[model samples]
Target chain A: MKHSLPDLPYDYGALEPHINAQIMQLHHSKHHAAFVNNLNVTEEKYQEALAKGDVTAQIALQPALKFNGGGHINHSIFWTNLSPNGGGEPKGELLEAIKRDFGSFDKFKEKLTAASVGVQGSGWGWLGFNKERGHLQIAACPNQDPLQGTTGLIPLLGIDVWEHAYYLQYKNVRPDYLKAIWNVINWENVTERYMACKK
Target chain B: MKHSLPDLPYDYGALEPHINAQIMQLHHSKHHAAFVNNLNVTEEKYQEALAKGDVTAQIALQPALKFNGGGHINHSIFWTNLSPNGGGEPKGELLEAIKRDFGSFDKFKEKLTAASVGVQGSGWGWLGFNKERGHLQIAACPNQDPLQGTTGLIPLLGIDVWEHAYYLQYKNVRPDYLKAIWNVINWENVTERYMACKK
Candidate 1:
């Protein structure tokens, strides 16, 4: 079955001063919507190329598919990762795991922030579950390559550092924008994503 | 030998209306400068890694090398591709080649513009000379991979759609920025680049 765009759990302005209404509006409706449109188009061509046994065409189309497909997946998770009611420290089993794996929640944020800020260009920094190692791992995926698909780690949270994510409100100072994201981070959802990996 | 940042041919305000002063100032002094500085650092590490026989560190360093290396190469060409006295129709041998290969200059611009706008994330679109085929070809490179090194086509003109290139002035509408860029395109420089390929 073909995929479709999903609805955001809240309004564009819900994220408030943390992320402007304008940036959210464009990120969701315009930018993320483009990902879904291109994903389907890219998928159709792949099947055509697949049936024709055209590795040449298949390889050429790989980047196109990876970008849009992962853009759709990444943005979907990102929307849930934010909420008007969110902010402050994450608690419960998630906090315990953060303590065990990354030493403390503060350490984990900066670790993820470091990778997010260090990204030379457009990409994502992810907090993912390493089912094999059975711990949380941080990954920096450049472009739209999904964390699990490329890194074999289940994505619990992701920070999209694509300029489109924050340029309107934050300008070029990425560190400031990232600091602002913590104000609206939907830790409940991230914790929910974490609980799923235990099984 | 050390690679350093190059000065723009005109003042920061040179490419007015089309690309703003702020964007050019940051794109050069900040963005492109990072490339050159990191490139030298990247080169230094490679030498050290090779001397120490560390493939782990070396492989770890490849994408970093490609990122800054291609950014350095692409932006160097990009600055020359724009001028204060630029714009209008390209004539002489370059126009002849454009017509011969792409049917007309308008056709070539749209084709190049199509690829540039089509860029899903951070990347560049190039009009390259295929010496082997002896024709002008258009290419889209994602994440700073140089056209000539990756595609074997000599880059004559480049359109940087990295949001940093136009977001400040043009906002989210990339097509507008691309169309505006024609007002500052230095065809003489591009034409000179083309003539060198004939040899």
Candidate 2:
């Protein structure tokens, strides 16, 4: 099956002030669409190469496949994870589970923010649900590698730390972007994602 | 001496679509300012604690002082290195040195970007001038630790990879952000800084 760009739930301008309309427009249409397009092509080539038993082609395509495929997969989830009316806090079982595992919601936020803020390079900060451990954990994945492949956790909420995300607005100031993102975090989506991971 | 918040060379919204006004305001006025303020306080307390020969207080302040002070120093340099009309090719000695050291500017950018984008935890990706080695190299520093202290290189350009840097705008999509930042690289500043550093 071919990969495709997922439609955003909210309008492009919905995340304005915090994310801006132009960025959302270019990000979704040009950038994400490119990922989807490239991913499909890479996968198709990989399959053909695999069938032909061309080990060299298969090996060469590894980076392209991972870069484009991971880009498509990660971005698809990211779009829905934000909302114009998101953030505040996680409620119900999610909050309770957070408290149980991390002591308090505030502490969890602090640790998560720190970990997310602490990611050293172009990477991701994940609030993931660990199925086997039955606990929530924070993880940082470097580059385009998806969290599930790197860690056994189901990603609940993920933050990208690459410069293109906010360089136009924030320059090298990342903490400002990190602090503002709480305003649009889809905790409800996160909670649902977490609950789904249990089964 | 008190470390004050450095004034940005351009308006907060000067970078626009690349970065938004609100994010820049908070990033500079609030986040970067806090680092400067806290760093000064930590340094003052550290000196008093040292003078008093208070071991416990000294030890307790180490991490805070390092984190906040480093944050101040790094951000201070970061703001000036960005511009509303920056990015595009390097020239003069900086370009020559980049070609000599890393084979070419493109290779240097790729290597630096890869290192920056590939950092695992909260940290920095630095293209630093290594005075001792009389060469330029790429290094990663975890958290708010300065590149000089961590890697013994005088930073020419450093990329902050904390999720706060791009999470709101980029979500989990880092490569896009990394690729976009090159458009705003201040090669003039980077080159000048490099020239200032010597064996």
Candidate 3:
């Protein structure tokens, strides 16, 4: 089946004051849609190359597949990771895990925020679940590389650092955007993802 | 000496209509300015690390050095590469070289444009001179890596594909920005740089 763009769970303006409607509209409709469309095309090309047993062509198409495929995967999760009723602290098992792994909720926030702000270019900062270590982990992936694919960690939360993510509202000050994003973070969704790792 | 921001050869609005005043002002005063300041910081940290013979610290500083240092170098060349009175056909040795290397000037332009548009994320597409091959070559670099440092090719022209480069005007369509950029390309400066490689 061809990849398709997932609909956002909320209205375009729902995350407003924090992310703005314009950014949301374009991020979902234009950006993610492009990724889905491109991913389909890339896979189609790969299918032909694979059928012919052309290793060289298959290898060459690897980057396109990864970039577009990862873009689709990341953005799909990202929509659910934000909510109008988000922000504040998560509770229950997710809370206990955060405190146990990172010492406290605030410390976890600090680490995630630092990782996000420190990305030198277009990338993402993630709060992921490490099945091997049985603890929460933090990561920074360059470009649209998926967390699980790159680090073997299950992504519970992600903060996109691409300039398109914040350039319109925050201008060149990425840290400001990072700070604002915390106000609308879907802690509920993050907790759900974290809990899923158990099963 | 610590690197400082270089003054633009023309006013921010000089390359207007094609690049826009807001884009120019922010690109130079903010984006490029950040690169220069951070490069100085990177160098200073490296010096201290080297003095202490700390291999870990030295190794960690490499990415910062490459990102900031190459950003400064690339942008410095990029500014001179664009001029308001540009576009149309190039002439003399540079025009002849393009024909000899890529079949025609139009072919060279197509190659460079394709390379620039195909960059997956924040990066640059370059038209460079390969000293070993004695011909013009096109390349794409991820992030702020320099063409010379990464590929041993001397960059003659560079088109930044970072979203910040054209998001305000072109939005999600990078190809449009690429098409518009030709209108402001400084052929005179490019030819001069190419000529310098001879002597």
Report the Cα interface RMSD of each model, rounded to 1 decimal. 15.3, 25.4, 18.5
Question: TM-score of model 2 relative to the true fold?
Answer: 0.50
Sliding window of 10 residues with minimal summed lDDT for model 1 chain A = A50-59
Number of the predicted model whose lDDT against the real structure is largest: 1
lDDT of 2 by residue, A80-176 (tens): 7899989798999999999998899889888778887788888778888888888998888777667775565788888877776666667899888
Clashing pairs in 1: none
| Candidate 1 vs 2: which has more TM-score | 1
The CAPRI quality class of candidate 3 comes to incorrect
* Candidate 2 local lDDT, B1-199, one digit each (tens): 4567878888877876666677678778887888888877776775564345333344345467667767876777777667777888888878888899999888998998889888887777888888888888888888888876555678889877777666666777777667767777777888789889952
Across B28-125, the per-residue lDDT of candidate 1 in tens digits comes to 99999999899778767755654553333433455666788778888989999999999997999999999999999899888999999999999999
| Docking category of candidate 2 | incorrect
- The local lDDT score (0 to 100) that residue A32 gets in candidate 3 is 94
Candidate 3: give the clashing pairs: none
Q: Give DockQ per model, in order.
A: 0.02, 0.01, 0.02
Candidate 3's TM-score reads: 0.53
| Sort by lDDT, top down from the best | 1, 3, 2
Cα lDDT tens digits, model 3, B1-199, are 4566889989999987889889999999999999988977876775564455332344445567678877887888899999887888788999999999899988998999999998998999999999988888899999988887677788899998899889999999999999999999999999988998776
Candidate that scores best on TM-score:
1
